[PDB]
Write a sequence for this structure.
RNA sequence: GGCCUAUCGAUCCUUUAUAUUUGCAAAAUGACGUAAAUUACUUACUACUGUGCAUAUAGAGGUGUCUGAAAAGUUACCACA
RNA sequence: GAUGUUAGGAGGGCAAAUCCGCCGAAUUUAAGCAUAUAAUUAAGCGGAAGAAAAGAAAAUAACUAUGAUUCCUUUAGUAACGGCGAGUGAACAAGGACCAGCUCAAACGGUUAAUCCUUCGUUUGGUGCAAACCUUUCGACGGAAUUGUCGUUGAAUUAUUCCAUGAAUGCCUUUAAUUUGAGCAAAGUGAGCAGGAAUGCUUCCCCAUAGAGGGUGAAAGGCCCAUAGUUCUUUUUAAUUUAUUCAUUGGAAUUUUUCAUGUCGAGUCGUGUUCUUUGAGAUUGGAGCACUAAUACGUGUGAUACAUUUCACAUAAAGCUAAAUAUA
């Protein structure tokens, strides 16, 4: 059960914000290195496919890309993070 | 461990002791820590920690006292 | 075979043990019981000595 | 298996004779532990060998009203006392980094406890007859006379023990201060019923705050 | 111990006190709990009614601390005071005892029995029954929910 | 239910029904709904509140060696109780 | 990269109770048996120590929160697994024992690698009869080391306060323990009787802080060794006693005030898939294979698959470390 870090807890034993009544208490180098690495190394092969899907720029193509990324890395979380990161690169490069 | 540079240095020194012969044959390398399940602590690795055999032996161990 | 793990001892109970001590001391108090226990106590002046 | 008697359930089925151990050692082992620790205390220049510990409140629902010795005073508690961790460590006050003072009362209570121990202790000059003010907020050294007289005194160890909670349940209130209109049961069940919706709102506030 | 045992009473008697005709053979039904559902089914039906199969919801780790909560009935409540104190309250109407149910290690107050009529009492506890609240109120006392 | 005397099936499991009954373990998913309120981590108040899985209750899927092991032969080469 | 009877060194084997890796059964149980069970056992093979292993949070909780590891007491025959049969089976808290923390790597330091090592030497000691050990600073000449050793543990700066420091003269006393070997060690060899010979039987004497044990021609406190008791000497380690002057280099902790807000282990984690293993259940751990990440507002836990998201708690993929604890 959630607590509140302001409006201190009710003295009762159950329900929301409950319990005993004591007074509760209370990036530059990274970019440079990454940029150097990108100039040396370029994209992954899968990343190249992902770039082409993002470049197509449609709901079907983007949906396919998200699913593809999920298959390649395993799990939604990793795939989504990668798709957003590549998409951001594609927008920036296109600009 | 039979050459002075490791014997002198107070850093890293420990590996010269007689008790660290053959770490790789005993599961006392990073790989060793891995396959014994010693890398991951917490409830998830449960029984591994004092050694897998040791843990089994403690759990089996049946104990009596003089007066019961 | 006889093993190492016979039930050798017994957990005798605190309250009972205390009572046994009190009662044993009290029994010693009584003249007839000491004599009965077989001591040659015939010429002693008093049993709580 | 036969008639009324409960179902059998004895887990000696995997080999167990090769696995008994019978402790005939109890009293002798106890005597040994005592003798070593006593010997150590005797060795250590008449100093106590016990280390100070914070009082803490027990984990979870089960023991919420009870209090016991923890492990390690935290940085806030040391700072409040007027000590720094290494210095504290030398005079037997035990440290940690892990604890964090969640609520006010516990911090105040622990700094008072540290202070009481600190005020009590009297310090031997390190290299003899060379007494100085010293570092880290450790209490300053002392002369020969005070030390000599103090060594002769009994070292009272009461501070090391756990604090007794003084019972105060047998307590009295005037009848005409009682408020009889309250419904405790109703309040409780309603609070339980309303919990999900309150969480739903709280979650929304938390989202709002973070942006 | 040994001298009292049953076998010494029967000591020379061929069966050892264990039946000439059928004799005592090893493991005579099969081991332990085996005969359930089949040849010892009648014993299992007749002595352990509900035994076989599974029923109800699963619970992955109980973590028993969460759900701990000893009970007391109101009936015993005045008994948590010593005698002399109780008499003093009976004599003097103007004051009443508070009772903190936590200090004696109980969490929920239940409703068995009869309280002394017209002694108010203030009850501090984590949990109450519906009945208990009504009874405590009926005698003019108050319930205080407290952690 | 069939004029009466016959016409048949445990546990696990599955399956589909039922409910203003419940769970999924620190939390949330109807709905910022209804009032207010100020510009916000605001206050009340609401039987009905994601997917999937699970329970509880009720049938049904079958055990004809029918109170319910998933099971073919052979030994004149043979062993043992 | 070879090569060297080059110079200095090391490993091999034996021993296993406890201890650590593997590899790995079945008899058995189920009244049969095939999943289970026996059992992460036995056998097989490798490796250590006086104990080992584990260890300094990718922990638990959901509280008024705890807080490295091990062990005991316990939770618990419980949650749970299982022809949901036979049977198997944890964790958290709580009470204790003990109680100890740490360093690489990463960052930072170039008007100068401040490191490290062999060989040659060289001196302040102390013990010891001698043998010998044990302390002790100071240089060479080689090498090694920037494909990264060393220092530092954000950075300066204020006040306060400490610690190493070096020289002179002085001073090593009394006790307490502790542990070895050492000594010394109380009174009857009194009648009489029967006996081969009392230590027996009487009876008259006694000693005991010793009437434990043993020996002696039959049961001996006084026959003997020993025993009780002490007196020394041995081990180490407490307490106590005395330092005082002068000397300079170097380091540390708070505290002010600034300014910097930095770093954090990849074919690894993860996921799929397999097989194994488990209390682990739409996978507990391991393992093979395939795919293969993110940078701290990250990513990992929060025991039912998932999405969209809170919040608590942690900081993986490098290392070490006493204690308790175990011993057929």
């Amino acid at each position: 059960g959630r607590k509140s870090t302001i409006k201190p807890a009710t003295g009762i034993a159950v329900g929301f914000n409950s319990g005993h009544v004591v007074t509760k208490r209370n990036s530059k180098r990274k970019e440079l290195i990454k940029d150097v690495v990108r100039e040396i190394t370029g994209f992954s092969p899968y990343e190249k496919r992902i770039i082409e899907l993002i470049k197509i720029g449609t709901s079907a193509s983007t949906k396919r890309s998200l699913k593809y990324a999920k298959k390649k890395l395993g799990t939604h979380k990793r795939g989504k993070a990668k798709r957003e990161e590549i998409q951001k690169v594609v927008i920036l490069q296109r600009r | 461990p039979n050459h002075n540079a490791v014997r002198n240095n107070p850093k890293i020194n420990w590996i010269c002791n007689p008790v660290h012969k053959h770490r790789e044959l005993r599961g006392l390398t990073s790989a060793g820590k891995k396959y014994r399940g010693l890398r991951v602590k917490g409830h998830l690795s449960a029984k591994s920690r004092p050694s897998i055999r040791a843990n089994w032996k403690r759990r089996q161990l049946i104990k009596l006292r003089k007066c019961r | 075979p006889t093993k190492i793990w016979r039930r050798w001892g017994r957990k005798v109970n605190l309250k009972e043990k205390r009572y046994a001590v009190c009662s044993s001391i009290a029994a010693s108090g009584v003249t007839s019981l000491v004599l009965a226990r077989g001591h040659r106590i015939s010429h002693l002046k008093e049993v709580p000595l | 298996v036969a008639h009324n008697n409960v179902l059998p359930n004895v887990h000696l089925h995997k080999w167990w004779q090769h696995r008994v151990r019978v402790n005939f050692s109890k009293n002798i082992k106890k005597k040994k532990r005592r003798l070593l620790r006593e010997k150590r205390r005797k060795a250590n220049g008449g100093t106590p060998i016990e280390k100070l510990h914070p009082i803490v409140h027990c984990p979870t629902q089960r023991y919420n009203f009870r209090t016991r010795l923890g492990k390690g005073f935290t940085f806030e508690e040391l700072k409040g006392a007027g000590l720094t961790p290494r210095a504290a460590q030398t005079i037997g006050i035990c440290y940690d980094k892990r604890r964090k003072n969640r609520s006010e009362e516990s911090l105040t209570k622990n700094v008072e406890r540290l202070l009481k121990y600190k005020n009590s202790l009297v310090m031997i000059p390190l290299k003899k007859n060379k007494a100085k003010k010293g570092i880290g907020g450790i209490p300053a050294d002392a002369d020969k006379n005070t030390i000599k007289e103090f060594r002769n005194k009994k070292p009272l160890l009461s501070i090391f023990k756990k604090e007794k909670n003084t019972k105060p349940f047998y307590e009295t209130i005037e009848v005409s201060k009682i408020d009889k209109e309250f419904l405790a049961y109703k309040t409780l069940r309603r609070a339980k019923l309303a919990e999900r919706r309150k969480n739903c709102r709280q979650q929304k506030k938390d989202i709002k705050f973070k942006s | 111990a040994t001298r009292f045992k049953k076998n010494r009473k029967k000591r020379g008697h061929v069966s050892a006190g264990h039946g000439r005709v059928g004799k005592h053979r090893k493991h005579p039904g099969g081991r332990g709990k085996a005969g359930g559902l089949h040849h010892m089914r009648i014993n299992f039906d007749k002595y352990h009614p509900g035994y076989f199969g599974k029923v109800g919801m699963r619970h992955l780790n109980l973590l028993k601390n969460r759900t701990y909560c000893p009970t007391i009935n109101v009936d015993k409540l005045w008994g948590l005071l010593p005698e002399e104190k109780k008499k003093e309250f009976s004599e003097n109407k103007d004051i009443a005892p508070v009772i903190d149910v936590t200090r004696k290690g109980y969490f929920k107050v239940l409703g068995n029995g009869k309280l002394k009529h017209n002694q108010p009492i203030v009850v501090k506890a984590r949990y109450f029954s519906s009945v208990a609240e009504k009874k405590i109120k009926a005698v003019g006392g108050q319930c205080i929910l407290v952690a």
Notes: Strands of chain B lie at 62-65. The two ends of chain B are 51 Å apart (CA to CA).
